Write an enzyme that holds these catalytic residues in place. Structure first.
Site, PDB file in Angstrom:
ATOM      1  NE  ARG A  54      62.305  38.650  86.785  1.00  0.00           N
ATOM      2  CZ  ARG A  54      62.309  38.627  85.456  1.00  0.00           C
ATOM      3  NH1 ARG A  54      61.597  39.513  84.774  1.00  0.00           N
ATOM      4  NH2 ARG A  54      63.026  37.719  84.809  1.00  0.00           N
ATOM      5  N   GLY A 112      60.197  39.024  77.926  1.00  0.00           N
ATOM      6  CA  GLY A 112      59.743  37.666  77.708  1.00  0.00           C
ATOM      7  C   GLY A 112      59.737  37.302  76.240  1.00  0.00           C
ATOM      8  CD  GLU A 163      63.651  28.663  83.695  1.00  0.00           C
ATOM      9  OE1 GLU A 163      64.535  29.371  83.168  1.00  0.00           O
ATOM     10  OE2 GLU A 163      63.901  27.592  84.288  1.00  0.00           O
ATOM     11  CG  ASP A 164      61.831  35.391  82.885  1.00  0.00           C
ATOM     12  OD1 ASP A 164      61.203  35.537  83.954  1.00  0.00           O
ATOM     13  OD2 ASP A 164      63.079  35.367  82.827  1.00  0.00           O
ATOM     14  CB  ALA A 165      57.880  31.905  78.143  1.00  0.00           C
TER      15      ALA A 165
END
Ligand SMILES: [Zn+2]
Ligand SMILES: [Zn+2]
Ligand SMILES: [Zn+2]
Ligand SMILES: [Zn+2]
Lengths: 50, 46, 65, 1097, 55, 49
Positions: free
Chosen positions: D902, D870, D727-729
């Site tokens: 997004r 991130g 998740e967004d990392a």
């Protein structure tokens, strides 16, 4: 003007033409270094006006 | 003990003692830095 | 501030080809042909040299001296 | 046959930026304040005299501000640079002096140079030392040439006065009340008084409410009191429409119910309704003439204009009582922007009035009884009053003007020095008048009136979303005009006087009212000719180009606005389907034959206000120009602000993504300026090897961001790897971080002061306490030099002193106690410089600049210039990174799953453009609503032998086998944020507690612990863990053992009850300390809690 | 001093956000924890001087 | 319900900070309110005398 840590990091990235097979790994600790497992490079530059 | 300092514009080594008005000769600037130490410092290339 | 010695992705020595690149900017060479003549085949070194900003002299202009 | 398009039209944008733009607004406002407005303020209070001992006066002749100087030298001024003021923690101000003439003993004495105050000088102003300087001279003064300036320097800190936004004054606002009643309001504000008077229809009749009246009175009584006594004339002034009379009927009936039929009776009734501050009649007439509707002027007690004004207001209320044509507050055509100039003018006026009052009081107290020695003002001209007032108002930020009853807060804010973009964006900020009083969601919304004026996407994410905004790239704020030639041209253009005709003509459909800053200018017929002639005269140059004219056909009102604070935007004039600006004009501009002022004078480009553009037709492009077009848009990408200009291809991304990107760019890490090394701030973040982006917008070239980048271009591959980027990392390369990628520097400041007290004693620094055992300084005093001050070049560890400060305890031998400045830090720090300065108070100021070199690790927050914030999930070695056929391994691996939710196609376009650019050695443009297309970069990719879609054949580094799907490689401009895991990591032992309530402190810098809020208690209750909740909230937080007496139920001490004078019934009891504090406070409030103890069985 | 051995070599050293007194010989603490005021109350508390508070 | 004596709380509720940096201290608002109340009592007694 260049930072000391940045200067050390730039100097660390400079490759050395020394043959690695003729040296050995430095043991744990021993920051003084011995003839077998270390090399010393002196850099002394004094900038002045022409 | 001779304490040395460096001015901000002329960059000359000035020796002043304790409880002196912070100034510099041949000028009037009042920013006085301390020279770098002479002790050995070890850095890591990491 | 200053041109890095090693490339971020690969690690080719690029700090030694900066001032010469500036010479290629002093000459009539463009960016692409200069980066080609310097020996940069992969685009990572091309990005490293092209996108680098020379801020060391701007700081030395404010150096004590 | 396509319409020809001027390709170089965008060249109109930089030329404008040469005279106006981002930072020129505050500079011009401060210059107008210090050059024109201050002289007017001085002229308004040029003469001050006291009632006692007449023929005595103090006459001001001329006031000067001079050049900025410093009073460090003994009674000597000296030019001081702003950087020196930043270093010495002083203010950058100039001595305000004035020449005067007074009477000491009836002998007139004149003074030619007498300083009276100190005005802080805005940077890059007219009198600032930074203006008119070359970058070499900037280097000589230790100032960055790219610094925007426009901010004040007070006591060493940089304060910026945000642009204030408020409602337009002297304007009728028709709005619904709490109960749904559609009433009207008018806030008449003059140079002296401000009064908001309202009108309601609560009971079918119009009542007028004002703060100076006991009870709201009918409008017909006020009409009769203002001269017009015939009801027929009142009805004609209100309107001749059948529905108008039907609505106004109840008011006439209620007026006829009473015996009010003349002006005297109505004035007597009003005076009876007048609140305490025939005499009542005079007070009522004065309130009607001066207090009520201050903006409407009466020549000599002639309320004809005021009668017409209130009649038009009643007519508007009647028309609004039908179709719900309620005016909205969020319409920016009715907004006004106050810069720092007007605020400083009001503050200086208030301070000068206070100084004059104090001088008059001192004169009245000294002159009549002192001695034959004649008193003179020069012996009492306090020079610190105005200086301290200005310093406090700029530093604290709270403005309290009692003469205007204005109590504002948060006017000045600390300039953010996180990066160049941060300061450049904070310089053009605008706050709202609401200031989070209520979540209205009306003004917080994005109104269409913000077109071309304010940036739509740039807004701080959080509680201040919608109340703090940024100006557009191409915008300007107007100033006040003389309003004389406007009135002259309006009178000469056939506008008939309102006093010559009755109000019946106001009800005609073809008669249009012309106003002027809220004042009824008159009536007119065929307003089209009037508007066309006014616009042509403004274009010719006889009328100021900032005077706006608008027409409202619904209300049939022609508004002529000439007050300052209005937002205007330049537009190319279009006449007969062809713009006035051609290719020849742009060629002359490029060659230097003409400038933007020549375009303004030759009727080519003109400024349009929101109200004016409401009636005009603007075309986005040349192909959109139709027959009904009056103006042409210069450049569409000017809609975005300064921060939003950094977004490459912003029209391909989502709006929350752009908002998050602006918010993170305001916190982006990078270089500040060319003088960032000599600059000593409390917190500075610098990048080791900053690189300019490959996909740069034209706004970047305009703001010169490429000279000071705040990020690095890394070969990012969009793929999933090892599942450490869920998740967004993002996954970082170990070799990349080892070779200098992402290396950052954190500079902190440690300041110490050695001040002299009232007694003849001073703070002194002791030498390093050498250990007699080893003849060497102790581990705590190891880094100290011979003078007791830490020397630069060494490393500082935790629990180490930097300045061995010792201060006396007396204020016979002085007794010094040690208060050294210890270094609180988890990691080691290196000293870069130690600056020692001396102020006028003999106080030695010592500032150490500690430096820390940090490497990206797990927990460091990174941005990708597209709002894709991130955190580094895993740092894999170089061999673990996948490799292509050429052998390039990626530095950053980002999760692709963030793209569908997004819809950040702009990131893919930027990646493709950057890849094409680094392949062909070019810099592609990500200009909004334009830039390089996809076909061009695809051709560039196919020409160099790479794939036309970015996806390349990649072999897995782990298994050594090729991947089934191609990986999307390309250079992306990633920027590191100031949010570091090292600064956010916190752990709390038992530690200290607060004196009042024995609980851990709040902040991390205060060694505070975490707070189990109410929601945590609710969760623990829902889980049912009683023992865990008891251990957390009682045992581990504020556990204590008190002594309670079983007889009276009060609290004892040491097993003794002072109330009963016995100790047999006293027993120990475990309790939270906060509960005991509550019990003690309740006993203080006479609410005595009597505790009846019992056995636990 | 030390309660058991009587050694008076007690040193003030900052722990992990904790202040205490400990002897370097036996490592035994004699007084742990410190009470400090919070800035939340510091801005609320008002100043009092000696002259005004004496008359 | 009608008060004739005021219960001044202990010092635990009214923390006192010794600010040696200037010629002053830090005392809470309750101390100032009690000081004003005692001052008013003394003024009333003086006017009665
Ligand atoms: Zn000097
Ligand atoms: Zn490379
Ligand atoms: Zn008892
Ligand atoms: Zn012991």
């Amino acid at each position: 003007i260049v930072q000391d840590e940045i200067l050390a990091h730039r100097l660390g990235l400079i490759p050395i033409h020394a043959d690695p097979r003729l040296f050995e790994y430095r043991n744990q600790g021993d920051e003084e270094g011995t003839e077998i497992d270390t090399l010393q490079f002196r850099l002394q530059v004094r900038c002045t006006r022409n | 003990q001779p304490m040395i300092y460096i001015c901000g514009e002329c960059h000359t080594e000035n020796e002043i003692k304790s409880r002196d008005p912070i100034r510099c000769r041949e000028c009037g600037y009042r920013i006085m830095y301390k020279k770098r130490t002479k002790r050995l410092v070890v850095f890591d290339a990491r | 501030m200053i041109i890095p010695v090693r490339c971020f992705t690969c690690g080719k020595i690029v700090g030694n080809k900066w001032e010469a690149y500036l010479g290629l900017l002093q000459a009539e060479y463009t960016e692409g042909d200069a980066l080609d003549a310097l020996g940069l085949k992969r685009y990572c070194c091309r990005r490293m040299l092209l996108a680098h900003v020379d801020l060391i002299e701007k700081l030395l202009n404010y150096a004590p001296l | 046959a396509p319409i020809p398009t001027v390709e170089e039209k965008w060249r109109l944008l930089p030329a404008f930026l040469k005279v106006k733009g981002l930072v020129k607004q505050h500079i011009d406002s401060f210059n107008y304040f210090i050059n024109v407005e201050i002289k007017k303020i001085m002229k308004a209070n040029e003469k001050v005299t006291s009632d006692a001992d007449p023929m005595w006066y103090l006459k001001y002749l001329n006031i000067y501000v001079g050049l900025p100087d410093v009073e460090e030298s003994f009674n000597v001024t000296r030019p001081v640079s702003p950087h020196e003021c930043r270093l010495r923690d002083m203010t950058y101000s100039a001595p305000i002096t004035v020449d005067i003439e007074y009477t000491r003993g009836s002998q007139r004495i004149i003074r030619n140079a007498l300083p009276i105050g100190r005005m802080p000088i805005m940077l890059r102003s007219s009198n600032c030392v930074l203006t008119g300087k070359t970058p070499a001279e900037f280097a000589k003064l230790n100032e960055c040439p790219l610094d925007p300036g426009g901010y004040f320097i007070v006591k060493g800190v940089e304060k910026v006065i945000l642009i204030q936004e408020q409602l337009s004054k002297n304007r009728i606002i028709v709005e619904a009340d709490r109960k749904g009643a559609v009433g009207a309001s008018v806030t008449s504000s003059t140079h002296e008084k401000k009064s908001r008077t309202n009108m309601a229809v609560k009971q079918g009749r119009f009542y007028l409410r004002h703060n100076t009246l006991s009870e709201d009175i009918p409008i017909v009584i006020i009409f009769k009191a203002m001269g017009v006594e015939s009801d027929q004339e009142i009805v004609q002034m209100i309107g001749t429409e059948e529905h108008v009379m039907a609505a106004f009927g109840p008011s006439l009936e209620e007026c006829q119910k009473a015996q009010i039929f003349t002006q005297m009776q109505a004035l007597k009734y009003i005076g009876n309704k007048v609140r305490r501050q025939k005499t009542k009649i005079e007070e009522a007439r004065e309130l009607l003439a001066s207090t009520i509707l201050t903006h409407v002027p009466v020549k000599e007690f002639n309320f004809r204009a005021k009668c017409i004004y209130t009649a038009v207001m009643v007519r508007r209320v009647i028309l609004a009582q039908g179709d719900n044509k309620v005016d909205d507050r969020d319409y920016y055509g009715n907004k006004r922007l106050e810069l720092a100039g007007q605020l400083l003018s009001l503050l200086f006026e208030d301070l000068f009035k206070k100084f004059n009052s104090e001088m008059k009081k001192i004169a009245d107290q000294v002159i009549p009884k002192q001695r034959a020695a004649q008193f003179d003002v020069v012996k009492h001209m306090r020079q610190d009053q105005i200086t301290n007032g200005m310093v406090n108002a700029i530093s604290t930020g709270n403005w309290s003007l009692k003469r205007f009853k204005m109590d504002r807060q948060g006017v000045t804010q600390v300039l953010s020095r996180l990066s160049y973009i941060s300061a450049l964006g904070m310089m053009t900020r605008i706050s709202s008048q609401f200031e989070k009083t209520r979540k209205v969601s009306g003004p917080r919304s994005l109104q269409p009136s913000q077109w071309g004026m304010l940036c739509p996407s740039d807004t701080p994410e959080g509680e201040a979303c919608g109340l703090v905004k940024n100006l557009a790239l191409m915008t300007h704020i107007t100033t006040d005009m003389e309003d004389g030639p406007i009135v002259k041209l309006a009178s000469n253009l056939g506008v008939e006087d309102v006093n010559l005709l009755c109000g019946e003509e106001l009800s005609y459909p073809n008669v249009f009212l012309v106003f002027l800053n809220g004042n009824i200018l008159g009536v007119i017929r065929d307003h089209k000719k009037l508007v066309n002639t006014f616009r042509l005269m403004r274009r010719a140059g006889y009328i100021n180009e900032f005077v706006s004219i608008s027409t409202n056909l619904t209300d049939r009102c022609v508004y002529i606005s000439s007050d300052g604070g209005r937002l205007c935007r330049p537009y190319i004039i279009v006449k007969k389907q062809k713009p006035a600006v051609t290719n020849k004009h742009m060629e002359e501009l490029a060659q230097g034959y003409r400038n933007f002022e020549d375009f303004l004078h030759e009727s080519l480009v003109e400024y349009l206000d929101v109200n004016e553009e409401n009636d005009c037709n603007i075309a986005l492009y040349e192909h959109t120009i139709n027959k009904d077009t009056t103006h042409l848009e210069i450049e569409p990408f000017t809609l975005l602000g300064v921060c939003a200009g950094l977004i490459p291809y912003p029209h391909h991304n989502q709006s929350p993504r752009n908002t998050y990107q602006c918010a993170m760019g305001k916190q982006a890490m990078g270089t500040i300026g060319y003088n960032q090394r000599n600059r000593i701030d409390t917190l500075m973040y610098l990048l080791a090897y900053p690189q300019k982006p490959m996909v740069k917008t034209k706004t970047i070239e305009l703001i010169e961001f490429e000279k000071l980048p705040a990020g690095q271009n890394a070969t990012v591959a969009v793929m999933s790897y090892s599942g450490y980027d869920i998740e967004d990392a993002l996954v970082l390369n170990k070799a990349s971080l080892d070779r200098g990628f992402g290396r950052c520097l954190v500079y902190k400041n440690a300041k110490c002061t050695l001040k002299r007290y009232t007694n003849q004693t001073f703070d002194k620094v002791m030498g390093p306490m050498l250990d007699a055992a080893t003849r060497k300084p102790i581990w705590r005093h190891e880094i100290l030099d011979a003078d007791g001050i830490c020397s630069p070049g060494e490393k500082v560890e935790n629990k180490q002193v930097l300045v061995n400060k010792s201060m006396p305890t007396v204020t016979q031998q002085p007794q010094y106690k040690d208060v050294p400045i210890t270094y609180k830090g988890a990691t080691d720090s290196y000293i870069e410089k130690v600056m020692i300065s001396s102020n006028a108070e003999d106080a030695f100021l010592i500032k150490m600049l500690l430096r820390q070199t940090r490497r990206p690790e797990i927990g460091d927050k990174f941005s990708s210039r597209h709002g894709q914030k991130g955190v580094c999930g895993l740092i894999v070695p170089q061999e673990d990174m996948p490799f292509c056929d050429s052998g390039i391994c990626p530095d950053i691996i980002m999760n692709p799953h963030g793209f569908p939710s997004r819809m950040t196609v702009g990131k893919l376009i930027e990646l493709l453009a950057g890849k094409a650019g680094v392949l062909d050695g070019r810099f592609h443009y990500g200009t909004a609503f334009g830039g390089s297309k996809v076909k061009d970069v695809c051709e560039d990719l196919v020409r160099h032998g790479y794939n036309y879609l970015g996806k390349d054949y990649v072999t897995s580094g782990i298994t050594g086998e090729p991947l089934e799907a191609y990986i999307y490689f390309g250079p992306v401009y990633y920027q590191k944020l100031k949010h570091m895991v090292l600064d956010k990591m916190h752990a709390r032992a038992r530690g200290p507690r607060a004196v009042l309530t024995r609980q851990p402190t709040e902040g991390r810098s205060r060694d505070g612990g975490l707070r189990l809020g109410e929601m945590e208690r609710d969760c623990l209750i829902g889980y049912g863990a009683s023992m865990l909740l008891l251990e957390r909230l009682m045992i581990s937080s504020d556990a204590f053992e008190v002594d309670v007496c079983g007889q009276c139920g009060l609290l004892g001490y040491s097993g003794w009850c002072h109330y009963c004078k016995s100790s047999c019934h006293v027993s120990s009891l475990r309790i939270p300390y906060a509960c005991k504090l509550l019990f003690q406070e309740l006993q203080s409030m006479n609410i005595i809690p009597r505790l009846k103890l019992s056995k636990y069985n | 001093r030390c309660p058991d051995c009587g050694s008076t070599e007690l040193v003030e050293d900052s722990h992990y956000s904790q202040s205490q007194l400990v002897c370097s010989d036996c490592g035994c603490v004699v007084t742990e924890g410190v009470l400090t005021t919070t800035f939340s109350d510091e801005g609320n508390l008002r100043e009092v001087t000696y002259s005004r508070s004496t008359g | 319900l009608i008060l004739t004596r005021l219960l001044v709380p202990p010092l635990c509720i009214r923390p006192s900070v010794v600010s040696d940096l200037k010629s002053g201290t830090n005392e809470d608002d309750l101390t100032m309110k009690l000081t004003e109340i005692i001052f008013l009592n003394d003024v009333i007694k003086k006017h009665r005398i």
